[PDB]
Symmetry: D2
Subunit: 426 residues, 4 copies
């Protein structure tokens, strides 16, 4: 099944083929003079994948308003159809991350559709930061760390159910992010709340298959505006170390305090074997959830520099579960995810260009200037040709968004899906 007509992809690829060959060959020659085999780089890029969030193909909003576009997906099945477009064009997003109960449906169907669309399933995502219809206990004052035992049990039960759904569709991990925290000093006893969280998470841990992982995700604030139980990587580390070997930490780019050195957190988690994976996006003020690399592309590169450094050396078990976690409020969700997945592969490719041996030498000699310049020589390289050729060689589009717009896909689904209404948030 091809969401995007093959004729359109071929047409748009041929229209740009000539320019691509010129740019690829020019870059190839430049890299050659730099002792780098462009083909080796392209080969790895072609194999780099990042999961797409099911809740990301729909238009997002803020607490102030939501301005939906046309052809908004009705549910998981429409979302999968849309995710298929992203994968077909970029070839960098073969897997989709589901969120329950948003995407709750017959596991068999989900699996059937994914298979037909050529999509797999990444980490499951539980939802105890909002109340569902007919829910017995409200999560207003928390969930896994709520002071009421019944509420915690209900939360634990929900997460276990997410694991059951995941096993039936091919998932191998559960990502746990909660809003648990407080808005006022004194409202929560920091320690007791955390103790309650660890005990509940230990219950969820018991329901994990032997080849499954449990990812806890920290966030400094929002929805909690005074304190958050899992507020930073420090608390996250304590959680993972306490729960067990299958418990690891997820680092979401926009979940840190202003000016935080995020790439260091990545290196620390790697050093202690607790880097479960990433949640890519970009930001300038808070948890903005913007398109990856749209605000600080260098920071994205620096994070990948830590990832590649580890990938280059003795790769223990190092297999971080990478996923995109963004909100598209003023763009066509599909186009944003396409360029975001592209930016991630861009950062990765540039990180692969780093002369590791030279960098090591400058680090040992404390030649700070040359060390940073060694990183910049890689970062400054325009690897777009590598990314475009990788897509072309794997059945993708040279220029994904251009092909997407040429296909008229959005107008198509807009004519098949019911209209949406603009609204608020809170």
């Amino acid at each position: 099944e091809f969401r995007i007509a093959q004729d359109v992809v071929a047409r748009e690829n041929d229209r740009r083929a000539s320019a691509l060959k010129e740019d690829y060959e020019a870059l190839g020659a430049n890299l050659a003079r730099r002792g780098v085999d462009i083909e080796a780089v392209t080969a790895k890029v072609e194999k780099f994948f990042v999961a797409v969030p099911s809740w990301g193909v729909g238009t997002g909003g803020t607490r102030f308003a939501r301005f939906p576009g046309t052809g908004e997906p009705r549910g998981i099945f429409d979302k999968l159809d849309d995710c298929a477009v992203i994968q077909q064009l970029t070839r960098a997003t073969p897997n989709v991350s589901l969120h329950i109960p948003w995407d709750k449906a017959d596991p068999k169907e989900l699996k059937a559709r994914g298979d037909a669309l050529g999509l797999g399933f990444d980490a499951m995502n539980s939802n105890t930061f909002s109340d569902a219809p007919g829910q017995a206990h409200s999560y207003k004052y928390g969930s896994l760390s709520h002071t009421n035992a019944a509420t915690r049990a209900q939360a634990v039960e929900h997460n276990l159910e997410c694991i059951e759904i995941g096993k039936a569709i091919g998932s191998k991990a559960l990502t746990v992010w909660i809003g648990d925290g407080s808005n006022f000093p004194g409202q929560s006893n920091f320690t007791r709340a955390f103790e309650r969280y660890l005990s509940a998470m230990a219950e969820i841990y018991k329901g994990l298959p032997d080849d499954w992982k449990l990812f806890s995700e920290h966030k400094m604030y929002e929805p909690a505006f005074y304190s958050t139980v899992v507020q930073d990587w420090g608390t996250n580390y304590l959680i993972a170390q306490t729960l067990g070997p299958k418990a690891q930490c997820l680092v979401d780019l926009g979940h840190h305090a202003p000016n935080t050195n995020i790439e260091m957190i990545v290196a620390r988690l790697i050093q202690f074997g607790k880097l479960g994976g990433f949640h890519f996006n970009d930001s300038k003020y808070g948890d903005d959830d913007l398109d990856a690399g749209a605000i600080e592309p260098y920071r994205l590169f620096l994070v990948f520099n830590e990832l590649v450094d580890a990938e280059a050396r003795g790769v223990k078990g190092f297999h971080p579960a990478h996923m995109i976690d963004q909100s598209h409020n003023v763009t066509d969700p599909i186009e944003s995810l396409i360029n975001s997945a592209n930016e991630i592969r861009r950062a990765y490719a540039q990180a692969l260009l780093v002369d590791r041996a030279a960098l090591s030498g400058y680090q040992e000699d404390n030649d700070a200037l040359m060390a940073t310049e060694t990183l910049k020589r890689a970062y400054r390289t325009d690897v777009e040709p590598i990314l475009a050729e990788a897509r072309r060689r794997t059945g993708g589009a040279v220029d994904p968004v251009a092909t997407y717009r040429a296909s008229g896909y959005r107008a198509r689904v807009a004519a098949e899906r019911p209209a949406s209404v603009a609204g608020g948030g809170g």
Copy 2:
């Protein structure tokens, strides 16, 4: 009419009257030893009012969820009834701030309900940061600064409508806060978007009554996550200055960058005559919209210190509009607004205690330690007795929240209103 039974108020006041007399008399003796007449302070405190936001009367939420409590107001009229409780108990919130179209309803009836409940109306608040039913042009990419002329005109017209509603109920000001901005570099041309905004605001100013003020509110980010047209007080000053004498700047405490010295911004605006008013609330991370003084009470005091100093310096024509702008996500909105109004009067009261003569002396002599200690001697003073007595003498409750709960008001409206 009284939303809260008068016998409950009297009862809960008598129950605490003895202790209050003890604390008030003790504080009185302490202030007298400091050369301060406690009566002069109480008199000023009972005259300090801050407007309550109609949109803060119902439970608030985030982009992740909203967890409504019981007895949620069904509309503006229920909201006015709840606002009447806040005023009755604290006596510090006689006026309500309306937001259109959220509170759109027959102005004539709003006025009638207000008068009956003993409530007045503060500044009107326009809303072009969200789309309304049947709206011709979406504000997705902006409003007053939108690239499309027809959209900007529609936004201007909406603001003029807000003025018409306000004139009918006795409002004398229009506050304009928009989300206009960009989420990506390059999406907007900073200068052209600002030029469009200035031109639209000029049209609104043209339609502003000569007995009204026009307040522009700056905000660093949210809903825009890369750039915001009216992002800080600098741009806000340029706006007010450009528009005219009737245009001023509104300062919302949670709308500034991390570590910003907000009290300095307040002083700067006062010095150049553009401090239109305040939107009180507290915060720790961003525009958290938490109960005022719940996070950084000293900062709140420092802001009031600049307000009181303005009077001491002889600044004239200075009558800032005071308004609360908060979101109550995990508490009873009424109780939060009650304690927030209380906290604001608390900071004001402490600012009144500052020995201006001593402070001035320490500032001229560059005695930093004693200057800061002079501020602390005021801030460290527990003025709760003054706050409680002010309420008691004006028909309010010694302990507002305690009386509120003792009245069972929440359960009452929970029964009258759906779930």
Copy 3:
């Protein structure tokens, strides 16, 4: 006696009447709240915080240093000044030394301390600056420097600090270093940390059985891109890796903007790694300002966590309390006096918190009453308690005013030549 006893007596008597009135008034108010003021005063008078030897001299920035008169010429003058702080506040019996700044014959330091009635807190090592005759520079790091010989030199320096501390009565070594990078790529984050861990393991081996090793994290400065011990997470990994004797020190001004510092304190306590505190205040970065001068509520909330620990019955909880400030525009002695006072102030207020009520409100998720329970304690002016604690222990009712009446500064100015 650094300050004449007749001066202390005279100033105490001059303020005795007002102290009596305020204390008794507060005593009655607390009694009505079910609190025994005598019990609070008894604990307050036993709360001690170490004074930094390096804080008695005027501090500066990279732009300039503006010394005052009578700057101490060395460690002995510094101890003399520290004795003034202790005599007047009775809250700072111990001094924290820094090597090599305070290097001197251990026997003489001990003798001077005993003579002045002062003890010694944790020793502090210095590998963030180069001393004369140093075989290796710390320009690119110390304990984590790529060069093995440089790390060895840093280790030996720390071992020397322990030897000095053992001779004077110290029972801990605090390690803060500037190690980090100013450019991406300059350092391999993991290898630099591994080098640090190896060096610290060596230092740990030289620890007596009753000693502790405190590592102090800092987000930035002097390193402006990355810092090896950048936050509490890395700090926890250090203490856990080193062993039972290794704990973490939390310096209030060393965290990222908006960080919830009190939570960090609670987390470290829960896992038994809260070695101690470095008290100070700040608004922008590691400003090192007088404790409580900027965010007094935050200071109170940190103490609320320390007191709750005691309430929860945490076993063997004896954090080391120390002031770590820089006094750039005030008399260092006066700032340390009022800073020690602010710390006792926040501690006293934390003791006033009705834990029983708080426990109930936290259980029932009554956020508003829970926060109001904390506020009822924080808003209480405990100055009378602090003042009476000093009176009873031979200190001054108003420390700074007594200091000024003594003419001490002028005295030492005439005795000490400016360099």
Copy 4:
């Protein structure tokens, strides 16, 4: 010449081949994009940024200063090192002086500058530190100090800076002061600012007809509670109040965390008060790190605003750019060289933006394509352009490599005595 010509020629020839390949390849790619590489290079070789005389010496923090070898002592040694940066990058023909640090006979300063092929940019006054024999201390402020005699002393000092500047070819005075408070209540915000404005009015009166007075805002440090000239808002009030010759200086690292600095640049340009931009980079505060070493995209976004205005020559838009950094762990000359390079890099990339296309995507509210239009320019590796520009103007293809090959540092190390060694 500070650096031997044969060394420059040798290191250029060594890299000439690869440069031709890369330059011709980029010229071809740009041609396909409808851009003439030559037009970009012609402008790049004419883009200059002043080097701070105080930037060639090793910087330090309040904890320590770790000097390298051959540290320049005094303005003459400093000019000698600044000449190296200019000869190799050809992007820093002018030096910014600081008084009293660089105090010396004007005639001699002018002579040494002409001899080295260096001019002089804005003068920089210093009332944030006390000089020996000073009548009044600046401990509690300078231009806004409560003591009248102290303000008068600060004003006279600034006037003296103007006199020195007039004698050496300078056409502006930059005023950055530490004035502020470390404690609430210590200063009366309004009165302090009034005193400042009054003192600046006096300095303004001493300005020649063709001179400019630049005020520089800073959120904090050395003042840790409040700063008189804390941000661009206050800065704008200053410039607007003083007159046509007064403008604002924007120092990248002087803003609150997460501030949108490029917007501040746009606002000032719109109102004709952008006097100049002080380049450096940062991650935490006023770190004063090498430009573009931390956030190169932000630097590009700032230049996007500059180029936009430079193309439409806005009224009052003639910014005086300068590098204002502190080099604590690198060879200062090498950092200034690579920082000047980064500045021209961001300038070159901003010059590549398809303004027509961008304006089109902005009007249609196509946020994705608008941001991608900026990225297409930013992702372009313009090093071949910067290198050819240097090669054509007498500089080095690879500045730092040529500097190291010359052995300059070892040379001045042998000529200048270190404190110990």
